[PDB]
PDB file of C-alpha atoms and ligand atoms in Angstrom:
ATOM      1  CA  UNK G   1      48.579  28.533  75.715  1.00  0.00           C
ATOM      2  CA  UNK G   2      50.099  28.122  72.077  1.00  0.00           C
ATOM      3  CA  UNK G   3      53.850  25.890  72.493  1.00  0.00           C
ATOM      4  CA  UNK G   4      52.674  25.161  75.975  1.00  0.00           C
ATOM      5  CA  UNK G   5      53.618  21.927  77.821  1.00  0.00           C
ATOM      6  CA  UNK G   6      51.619  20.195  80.418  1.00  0.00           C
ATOM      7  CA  UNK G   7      51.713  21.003  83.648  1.00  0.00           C
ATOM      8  CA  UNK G   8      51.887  18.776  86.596  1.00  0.00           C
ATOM      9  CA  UNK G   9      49.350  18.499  88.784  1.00  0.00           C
ATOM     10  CA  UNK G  10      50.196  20.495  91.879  1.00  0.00           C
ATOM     11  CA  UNK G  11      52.495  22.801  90.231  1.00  0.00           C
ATOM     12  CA  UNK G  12      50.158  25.982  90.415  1.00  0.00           C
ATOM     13  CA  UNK G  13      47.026  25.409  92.888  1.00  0.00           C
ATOM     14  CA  UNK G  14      46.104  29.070  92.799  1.00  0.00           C
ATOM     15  CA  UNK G  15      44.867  28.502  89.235  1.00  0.00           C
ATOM     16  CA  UNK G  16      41.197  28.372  88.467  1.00  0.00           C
ATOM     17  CA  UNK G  17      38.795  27.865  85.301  1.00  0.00           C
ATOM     18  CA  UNK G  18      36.132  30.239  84.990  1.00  0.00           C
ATOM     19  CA  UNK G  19      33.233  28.597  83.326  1.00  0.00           C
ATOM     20  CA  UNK G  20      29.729  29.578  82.266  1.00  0.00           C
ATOM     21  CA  UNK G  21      26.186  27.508  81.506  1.00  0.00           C
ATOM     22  CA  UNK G  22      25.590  26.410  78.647  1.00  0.00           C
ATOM     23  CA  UNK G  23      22.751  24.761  77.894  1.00  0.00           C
ATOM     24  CA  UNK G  24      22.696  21.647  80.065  1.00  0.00           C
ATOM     25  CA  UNK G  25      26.530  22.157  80.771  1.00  0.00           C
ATOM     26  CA  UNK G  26      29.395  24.317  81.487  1.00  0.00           C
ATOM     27  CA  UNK G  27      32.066  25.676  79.501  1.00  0.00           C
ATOM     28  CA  UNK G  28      35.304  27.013  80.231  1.00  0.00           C
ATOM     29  CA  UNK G  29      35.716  30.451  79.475  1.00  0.00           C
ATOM     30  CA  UNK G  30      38.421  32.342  81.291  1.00  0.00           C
ATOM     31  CA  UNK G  31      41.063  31.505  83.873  1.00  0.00           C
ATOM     32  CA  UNK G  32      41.460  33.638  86.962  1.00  0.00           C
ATOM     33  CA  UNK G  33      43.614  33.326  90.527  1.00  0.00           C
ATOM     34  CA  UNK G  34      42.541  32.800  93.938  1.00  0.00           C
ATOM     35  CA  UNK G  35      43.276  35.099  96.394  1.00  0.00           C
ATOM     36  CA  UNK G  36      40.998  34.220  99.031  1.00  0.00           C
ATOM     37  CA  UNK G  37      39.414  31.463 100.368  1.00  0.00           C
ATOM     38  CA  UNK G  38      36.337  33.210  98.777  1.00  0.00           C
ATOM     39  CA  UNK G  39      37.779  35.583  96.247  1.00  0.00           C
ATOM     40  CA  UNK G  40      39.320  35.045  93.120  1.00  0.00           C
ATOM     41  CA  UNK G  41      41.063  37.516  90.349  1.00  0.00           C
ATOM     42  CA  UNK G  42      40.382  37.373  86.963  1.00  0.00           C
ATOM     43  CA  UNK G  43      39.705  39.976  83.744  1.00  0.00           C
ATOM     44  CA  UNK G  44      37.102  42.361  83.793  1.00  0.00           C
ATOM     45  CA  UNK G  45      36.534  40.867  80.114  1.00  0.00           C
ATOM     46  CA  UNK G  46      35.678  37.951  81.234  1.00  0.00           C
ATOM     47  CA  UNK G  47      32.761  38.780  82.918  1.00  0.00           C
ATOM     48  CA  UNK G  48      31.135  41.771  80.705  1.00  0.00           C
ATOM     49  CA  UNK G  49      28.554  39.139  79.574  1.00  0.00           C
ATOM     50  CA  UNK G  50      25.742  38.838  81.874  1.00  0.00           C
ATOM     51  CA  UNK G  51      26.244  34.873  82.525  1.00  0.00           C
ATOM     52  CA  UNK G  52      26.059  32.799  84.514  1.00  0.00           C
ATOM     53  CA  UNK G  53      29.573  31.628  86.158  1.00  0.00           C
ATOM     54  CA  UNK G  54      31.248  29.402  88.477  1.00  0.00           C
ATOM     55  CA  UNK G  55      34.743  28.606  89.461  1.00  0.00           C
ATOM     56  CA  UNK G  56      36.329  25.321  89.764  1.00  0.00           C
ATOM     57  CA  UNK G  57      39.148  25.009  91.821  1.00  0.00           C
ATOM     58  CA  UNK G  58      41.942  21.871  91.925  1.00  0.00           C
ATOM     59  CA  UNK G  59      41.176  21.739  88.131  1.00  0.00           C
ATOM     60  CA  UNK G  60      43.798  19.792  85.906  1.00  0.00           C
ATOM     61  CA  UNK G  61      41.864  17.857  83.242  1.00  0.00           C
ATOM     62  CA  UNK G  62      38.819  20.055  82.150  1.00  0.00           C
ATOM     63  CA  UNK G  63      37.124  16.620  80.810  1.00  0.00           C
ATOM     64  CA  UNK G  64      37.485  13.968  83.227  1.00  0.00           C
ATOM     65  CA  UNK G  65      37.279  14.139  86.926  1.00  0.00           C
ATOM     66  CA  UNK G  66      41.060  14.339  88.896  1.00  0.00           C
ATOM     67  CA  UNK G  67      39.056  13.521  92.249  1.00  0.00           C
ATOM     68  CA  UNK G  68      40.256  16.955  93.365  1.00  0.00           C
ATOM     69  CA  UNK G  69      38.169  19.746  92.710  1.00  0.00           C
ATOM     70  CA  UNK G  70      35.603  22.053  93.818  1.00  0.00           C
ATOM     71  CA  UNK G  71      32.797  23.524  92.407  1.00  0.00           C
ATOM     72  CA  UNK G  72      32.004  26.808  93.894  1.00  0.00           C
ATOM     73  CA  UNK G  73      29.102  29.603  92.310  1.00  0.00           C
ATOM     74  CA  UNK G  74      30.222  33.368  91.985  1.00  0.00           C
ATOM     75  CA  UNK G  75      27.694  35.267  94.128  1.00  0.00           C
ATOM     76  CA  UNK G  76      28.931  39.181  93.648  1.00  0.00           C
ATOM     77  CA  UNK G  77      31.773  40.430  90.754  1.00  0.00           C
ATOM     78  CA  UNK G  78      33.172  43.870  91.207  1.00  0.00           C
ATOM     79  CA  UNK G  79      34.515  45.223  87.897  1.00  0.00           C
ATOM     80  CA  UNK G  80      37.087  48.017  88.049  1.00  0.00           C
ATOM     81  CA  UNK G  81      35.165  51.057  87.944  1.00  0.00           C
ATOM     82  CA  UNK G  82      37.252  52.237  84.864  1.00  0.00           C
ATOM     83  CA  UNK G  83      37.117  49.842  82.935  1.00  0.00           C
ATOM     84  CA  UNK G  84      35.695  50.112  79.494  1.00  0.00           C
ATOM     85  CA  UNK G  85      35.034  47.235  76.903  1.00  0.00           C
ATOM     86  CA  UNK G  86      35.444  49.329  74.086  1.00  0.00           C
ATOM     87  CA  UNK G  87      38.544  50.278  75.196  1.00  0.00           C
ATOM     88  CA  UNK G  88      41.099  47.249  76.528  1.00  0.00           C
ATOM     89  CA  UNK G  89      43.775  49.469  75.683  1.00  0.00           C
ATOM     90  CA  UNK G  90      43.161  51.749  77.951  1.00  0.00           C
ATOM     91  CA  UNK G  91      43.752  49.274  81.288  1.00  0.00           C
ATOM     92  CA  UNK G  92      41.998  48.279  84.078  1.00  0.00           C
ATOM     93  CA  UNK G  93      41.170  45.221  82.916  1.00  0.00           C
ATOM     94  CA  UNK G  94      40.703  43.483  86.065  1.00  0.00           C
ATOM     95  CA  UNK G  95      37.645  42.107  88.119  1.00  0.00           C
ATOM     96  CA  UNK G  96      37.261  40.151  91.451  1.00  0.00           C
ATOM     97  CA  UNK G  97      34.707  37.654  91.780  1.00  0.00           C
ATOM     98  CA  UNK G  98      33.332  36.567  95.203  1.00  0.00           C
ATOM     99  CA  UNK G  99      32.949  33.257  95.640  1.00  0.00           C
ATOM    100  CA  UNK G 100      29.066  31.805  96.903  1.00  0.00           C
ATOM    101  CA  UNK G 101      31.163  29.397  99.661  1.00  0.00           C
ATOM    102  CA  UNK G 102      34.689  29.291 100.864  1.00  0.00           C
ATOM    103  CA  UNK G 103      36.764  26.615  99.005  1.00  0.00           C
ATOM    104  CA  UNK G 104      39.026  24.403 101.078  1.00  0.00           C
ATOM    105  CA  UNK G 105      42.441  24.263 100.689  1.00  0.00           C
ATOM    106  CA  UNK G 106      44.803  21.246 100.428  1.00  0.00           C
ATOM    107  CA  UNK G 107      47.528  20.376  98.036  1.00  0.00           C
ATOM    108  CA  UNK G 108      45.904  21.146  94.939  1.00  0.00           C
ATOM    109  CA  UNK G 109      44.320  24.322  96.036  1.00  0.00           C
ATOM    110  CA  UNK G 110      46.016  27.176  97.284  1.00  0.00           C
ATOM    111  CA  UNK G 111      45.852  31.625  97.452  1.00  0.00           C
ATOM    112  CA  UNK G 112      47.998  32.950  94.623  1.00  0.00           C
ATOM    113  CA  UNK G 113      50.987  35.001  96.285  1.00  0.00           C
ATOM    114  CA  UNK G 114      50.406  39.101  95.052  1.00  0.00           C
ATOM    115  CA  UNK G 115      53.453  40.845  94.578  1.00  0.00           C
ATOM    116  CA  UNK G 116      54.020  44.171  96.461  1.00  0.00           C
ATOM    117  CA  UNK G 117      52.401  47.634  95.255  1.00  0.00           C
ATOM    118  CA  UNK G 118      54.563  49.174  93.005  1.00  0.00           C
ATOM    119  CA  UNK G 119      56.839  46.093  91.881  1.00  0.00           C
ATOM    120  CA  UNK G 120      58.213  46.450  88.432  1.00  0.00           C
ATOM    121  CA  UNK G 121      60.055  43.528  87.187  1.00  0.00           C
ATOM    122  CA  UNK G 122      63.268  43.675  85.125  1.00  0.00           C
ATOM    123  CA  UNK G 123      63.150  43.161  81.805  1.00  0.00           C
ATOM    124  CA  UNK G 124      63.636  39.595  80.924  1.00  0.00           C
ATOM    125  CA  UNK G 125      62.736  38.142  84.209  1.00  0.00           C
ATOM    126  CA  UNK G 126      61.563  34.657  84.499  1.00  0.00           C
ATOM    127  CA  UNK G 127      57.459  34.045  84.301  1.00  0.00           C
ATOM    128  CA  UNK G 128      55.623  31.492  83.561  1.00  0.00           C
ATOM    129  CA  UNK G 129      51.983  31.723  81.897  1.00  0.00           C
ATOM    130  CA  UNK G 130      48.971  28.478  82.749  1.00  0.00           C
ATOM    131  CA  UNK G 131      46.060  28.005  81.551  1.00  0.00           C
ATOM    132  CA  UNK G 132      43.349  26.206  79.623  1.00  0.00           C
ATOM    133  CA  UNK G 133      43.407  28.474  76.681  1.00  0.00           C
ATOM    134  CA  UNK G 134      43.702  27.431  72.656  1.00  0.00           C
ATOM    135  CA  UNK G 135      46.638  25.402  71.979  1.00  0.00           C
ATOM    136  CA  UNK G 136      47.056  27.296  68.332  1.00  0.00           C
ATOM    137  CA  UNK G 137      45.690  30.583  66.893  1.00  0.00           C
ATOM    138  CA  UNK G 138      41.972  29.624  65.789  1.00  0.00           C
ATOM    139  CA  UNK G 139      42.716  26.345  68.011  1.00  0.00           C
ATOM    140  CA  UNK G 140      40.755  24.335  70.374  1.00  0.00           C
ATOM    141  CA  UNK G 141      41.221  24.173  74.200  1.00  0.00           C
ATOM    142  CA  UNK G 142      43.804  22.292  76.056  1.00  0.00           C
ATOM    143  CA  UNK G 143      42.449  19.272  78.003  1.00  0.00           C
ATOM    144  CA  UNK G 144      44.639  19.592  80.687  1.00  0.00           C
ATOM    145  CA  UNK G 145      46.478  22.311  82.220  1.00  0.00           C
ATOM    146  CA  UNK G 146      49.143  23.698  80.412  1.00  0.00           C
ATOM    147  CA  UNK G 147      52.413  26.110  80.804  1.00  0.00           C
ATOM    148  CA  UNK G 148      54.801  28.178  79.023  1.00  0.00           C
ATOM    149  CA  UNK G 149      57.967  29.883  79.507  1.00  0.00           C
ATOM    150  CA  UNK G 150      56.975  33.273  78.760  1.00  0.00           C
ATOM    151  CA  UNK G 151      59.979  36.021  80.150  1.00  0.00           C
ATOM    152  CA  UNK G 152      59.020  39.722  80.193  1.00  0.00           C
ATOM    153  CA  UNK G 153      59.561  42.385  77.807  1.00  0.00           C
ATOM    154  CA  UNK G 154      60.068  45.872  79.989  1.00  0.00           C
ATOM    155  CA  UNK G 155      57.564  48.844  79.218  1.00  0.00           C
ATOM    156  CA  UNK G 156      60.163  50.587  77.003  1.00  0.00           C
ATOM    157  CA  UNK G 157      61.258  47.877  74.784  1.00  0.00           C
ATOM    158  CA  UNK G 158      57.251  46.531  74.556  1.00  0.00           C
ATOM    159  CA  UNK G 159      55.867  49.924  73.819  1.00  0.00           C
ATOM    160  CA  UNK G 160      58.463  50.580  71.004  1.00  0.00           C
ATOM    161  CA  UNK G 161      56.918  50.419  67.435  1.00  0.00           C
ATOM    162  CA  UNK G 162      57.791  47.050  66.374  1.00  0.00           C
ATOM    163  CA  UNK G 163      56.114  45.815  69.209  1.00  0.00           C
ATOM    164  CA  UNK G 164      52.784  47.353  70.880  1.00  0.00           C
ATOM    165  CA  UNK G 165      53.692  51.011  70.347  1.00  0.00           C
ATOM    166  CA  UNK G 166      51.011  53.250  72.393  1.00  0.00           C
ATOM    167  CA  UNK G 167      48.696  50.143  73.062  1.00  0.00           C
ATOM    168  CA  UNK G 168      50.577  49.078  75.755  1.00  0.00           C
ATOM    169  CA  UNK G 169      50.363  51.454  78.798  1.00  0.00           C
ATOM    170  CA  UNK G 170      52.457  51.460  82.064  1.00  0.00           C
ATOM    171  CA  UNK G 171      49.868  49.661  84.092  1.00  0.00           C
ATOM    172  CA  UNK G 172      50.459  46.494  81.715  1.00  0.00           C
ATOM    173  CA  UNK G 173      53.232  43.778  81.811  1.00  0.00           C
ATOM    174  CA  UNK G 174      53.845  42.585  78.405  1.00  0.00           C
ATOM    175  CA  UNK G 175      55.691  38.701  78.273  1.00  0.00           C
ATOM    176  CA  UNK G 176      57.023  36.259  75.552  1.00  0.00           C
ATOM    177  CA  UNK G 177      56.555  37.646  72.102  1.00  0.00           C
ATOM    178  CA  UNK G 178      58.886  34.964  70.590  1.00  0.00           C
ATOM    179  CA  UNK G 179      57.103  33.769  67.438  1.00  0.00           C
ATOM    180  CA  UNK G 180      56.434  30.372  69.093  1.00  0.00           C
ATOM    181  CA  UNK G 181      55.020  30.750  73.131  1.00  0.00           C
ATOM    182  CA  UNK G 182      52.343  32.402  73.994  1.00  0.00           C
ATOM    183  CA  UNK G 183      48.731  33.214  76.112  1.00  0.00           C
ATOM    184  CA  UNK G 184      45.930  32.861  73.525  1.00  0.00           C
ATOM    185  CA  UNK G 185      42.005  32.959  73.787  1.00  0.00           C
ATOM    186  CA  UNK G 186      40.747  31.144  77.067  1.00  0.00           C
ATOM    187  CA  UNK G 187      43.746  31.875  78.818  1.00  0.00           C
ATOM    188  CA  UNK G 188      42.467  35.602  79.498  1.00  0.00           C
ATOM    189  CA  UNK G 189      41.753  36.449  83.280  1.00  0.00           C
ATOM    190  CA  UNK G 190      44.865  33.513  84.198  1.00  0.00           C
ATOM    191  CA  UNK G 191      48.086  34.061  86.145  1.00  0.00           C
ATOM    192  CA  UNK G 192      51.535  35.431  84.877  1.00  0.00           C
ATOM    193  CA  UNK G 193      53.553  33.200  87.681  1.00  0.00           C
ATOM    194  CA  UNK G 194      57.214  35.171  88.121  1.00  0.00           C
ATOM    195  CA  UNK G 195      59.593  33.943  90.351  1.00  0.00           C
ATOM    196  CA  UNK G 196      60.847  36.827  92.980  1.00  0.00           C
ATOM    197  CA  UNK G 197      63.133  35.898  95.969  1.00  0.00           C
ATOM    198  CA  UNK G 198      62.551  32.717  95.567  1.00  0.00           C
ATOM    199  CA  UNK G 199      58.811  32.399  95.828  1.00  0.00           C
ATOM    200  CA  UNK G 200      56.487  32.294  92.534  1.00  0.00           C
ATOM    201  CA  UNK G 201      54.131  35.523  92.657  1.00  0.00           C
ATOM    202  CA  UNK G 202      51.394  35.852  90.146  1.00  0.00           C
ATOM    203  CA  UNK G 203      52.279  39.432  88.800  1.00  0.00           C
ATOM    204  CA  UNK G 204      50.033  39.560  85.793  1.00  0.00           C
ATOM    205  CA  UNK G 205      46.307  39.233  85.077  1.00  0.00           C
ATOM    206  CA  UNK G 206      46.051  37.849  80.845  1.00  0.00           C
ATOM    207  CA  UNK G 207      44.178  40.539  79.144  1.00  0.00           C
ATOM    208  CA  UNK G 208      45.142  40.250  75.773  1.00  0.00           C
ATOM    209  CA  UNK G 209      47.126  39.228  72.283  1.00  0.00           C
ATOM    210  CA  UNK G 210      47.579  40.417  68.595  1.00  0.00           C
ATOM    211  CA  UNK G 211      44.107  40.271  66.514  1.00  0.00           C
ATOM    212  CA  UNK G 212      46.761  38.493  64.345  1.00  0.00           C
ATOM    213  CA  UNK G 213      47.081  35.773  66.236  1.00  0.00           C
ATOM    214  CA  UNK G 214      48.328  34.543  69.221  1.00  0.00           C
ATOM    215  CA  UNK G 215      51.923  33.407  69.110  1.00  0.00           C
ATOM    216  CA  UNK G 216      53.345  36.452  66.840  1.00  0.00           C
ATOM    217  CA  UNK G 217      57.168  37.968  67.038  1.00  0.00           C
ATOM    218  CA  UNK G 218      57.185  41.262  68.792  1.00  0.00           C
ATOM    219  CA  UNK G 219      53.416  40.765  69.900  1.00  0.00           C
ATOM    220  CA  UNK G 220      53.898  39.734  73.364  1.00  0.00           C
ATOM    221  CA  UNK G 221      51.522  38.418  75.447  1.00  0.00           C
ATOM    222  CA  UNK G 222      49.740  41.463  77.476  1.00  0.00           C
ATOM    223  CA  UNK G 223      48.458  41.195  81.152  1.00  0.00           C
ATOM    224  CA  UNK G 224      47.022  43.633  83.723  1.00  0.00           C
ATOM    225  CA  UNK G 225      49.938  44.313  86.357  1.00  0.00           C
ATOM    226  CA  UNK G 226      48.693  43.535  89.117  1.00  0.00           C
ATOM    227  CA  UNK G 227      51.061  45.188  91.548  1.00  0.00           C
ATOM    228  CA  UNK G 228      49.501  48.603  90.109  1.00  0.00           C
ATOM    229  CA  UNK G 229      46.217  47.291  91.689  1.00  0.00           C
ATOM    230  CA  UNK G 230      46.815  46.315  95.219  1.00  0.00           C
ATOM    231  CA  UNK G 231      45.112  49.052  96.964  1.00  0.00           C
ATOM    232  CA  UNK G 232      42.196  48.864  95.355  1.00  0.00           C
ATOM    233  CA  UNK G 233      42.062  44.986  95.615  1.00  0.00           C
ATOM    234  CA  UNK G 234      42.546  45.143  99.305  1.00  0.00           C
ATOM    235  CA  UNK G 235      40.209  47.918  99.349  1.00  0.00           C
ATOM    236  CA  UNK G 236      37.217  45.642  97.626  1.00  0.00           C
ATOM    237  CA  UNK G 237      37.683  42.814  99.948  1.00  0.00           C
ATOM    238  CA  UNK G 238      38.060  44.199 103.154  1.00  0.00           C
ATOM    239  CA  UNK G 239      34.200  45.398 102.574  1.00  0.00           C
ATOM    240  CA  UNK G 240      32.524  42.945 100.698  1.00  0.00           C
TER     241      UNK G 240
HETATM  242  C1  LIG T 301      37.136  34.869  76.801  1.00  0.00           C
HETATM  243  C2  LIG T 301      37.988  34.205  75.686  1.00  0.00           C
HETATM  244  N1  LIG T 301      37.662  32.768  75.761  1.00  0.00           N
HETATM  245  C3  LIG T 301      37.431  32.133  74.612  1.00  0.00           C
HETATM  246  O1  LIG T 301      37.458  32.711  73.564  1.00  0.00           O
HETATM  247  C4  LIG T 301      37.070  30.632  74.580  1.00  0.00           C
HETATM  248  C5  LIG T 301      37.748  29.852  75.679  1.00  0.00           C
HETATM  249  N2  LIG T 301      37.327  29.881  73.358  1.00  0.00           N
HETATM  250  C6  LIG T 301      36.353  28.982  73.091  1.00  0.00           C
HETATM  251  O2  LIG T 301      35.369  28.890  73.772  1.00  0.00           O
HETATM  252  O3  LIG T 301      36.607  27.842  72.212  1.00  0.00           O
HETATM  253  C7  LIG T 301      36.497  27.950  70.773  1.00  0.00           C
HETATM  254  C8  LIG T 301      37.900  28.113  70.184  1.00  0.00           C
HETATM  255  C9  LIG T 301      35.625  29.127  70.284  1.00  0.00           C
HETATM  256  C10 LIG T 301      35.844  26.661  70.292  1.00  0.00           C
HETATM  257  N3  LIG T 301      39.389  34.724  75.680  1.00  0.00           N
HETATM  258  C11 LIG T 301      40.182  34.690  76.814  1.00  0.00           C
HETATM  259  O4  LIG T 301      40.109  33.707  77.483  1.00  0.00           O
HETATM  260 CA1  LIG T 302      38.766  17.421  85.991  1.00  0.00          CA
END
């Protein structure tokens, strides 16, 4: 998250790093949501390389241990069928991983609320991003959790042509774009937290930013709407 601050502790306990081995150790790589006790949402990007991943859960500093999380492996991920990595543009980017045990939840760990199918939120409307993600364009990683203040930009103002023009489709929510906050490499597959009624709903998936750079005017942050994929979410876990 570039002009991020940090987030307390238990402010968002449906937030997970997705990591992969490396060597002797693991590395984060992605952020995601959890849904389930056993299922978590994250970006079909995140997983096109044939790794292998695990999920921590009641994460806050990724180098030191908080005495709160879990370690859990991913036994089964279920890509959208349409999605295509040559083609991010084009959607779909969205992937749910199940989980090799069922995490337990307490404080720090909780299921991300999903918004309602359909759900389109007005433009300017309150959202926060999180995540682990580069702190500056061609950065390095935050240690510890971070957030930003990221408001959306409707589908008509983001897919004018001083902002994403056609590479922004329907099936996206675009936020921020302010020159200063934004999502930014490591932050992909992580919640877009938007406060409706009241409750904080996680209405975005991050899927992507400008190749010229993260924080740029008119280049809003991009995320998979998630409300355009509840049927086929509920459809995945009720038979796996
Ligand atoms: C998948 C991608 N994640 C990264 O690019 C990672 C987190 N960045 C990284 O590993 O650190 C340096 C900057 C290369 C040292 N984008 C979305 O999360
Ligand atoms: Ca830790």
């Amino acid at each position: 998250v570039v002009g991020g601050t940090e987030a307390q502790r238990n402010s968002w306990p449906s937030q997970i790093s997705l990591q992969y081995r490396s060597g002797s150790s693991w590395a984060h790589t992605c952020g995601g949501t959890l849904i389930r006790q056993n299922w978590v949402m994250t970006a079909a990007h995140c997983v096109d390389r044939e790794l292998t991943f695990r999920v921590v859960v009641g994460e806050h500093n990724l180098n030191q241990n908080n005495g709160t999380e879990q370690y859990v492996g991913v036994q089964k991920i279920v890509v959208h069928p349409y999605w295509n990595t040559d083609d991010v543009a084009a959607g779909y980017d969205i992937a749910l991983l199940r989980l090799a045990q069922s995490v337990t939840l307490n404080s720090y760990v909780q299921l991300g609320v999903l918004p309602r199918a359909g759900t389109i939120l007005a433009n300017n409307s309150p959202c926060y991003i999180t995540g682990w993600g580069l702190t500056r364009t061609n950065g390095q990683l935050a240690q510890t959790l971070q957030q930003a203040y990221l408001p959306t930009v409707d589908y008509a103002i983001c897919s004018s042509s001083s902002y994403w023009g056609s590479t922004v489709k329907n099936s996206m929510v675009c936020a921020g774009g302010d020159g200063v906050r934004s999502g930014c490499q490591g932050d992909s597959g992580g919640p877009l937290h938007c406060l409706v009624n009241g409750q904080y709903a996680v209405h975005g998936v991050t899927s992507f930013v400008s190749r010229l750079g993260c924080n740029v005017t008119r280049k809003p942050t991009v995320f998979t709407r998630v409300s355009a994929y509840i049927s086929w979410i509920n459809n995945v876990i009720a038979s796996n």
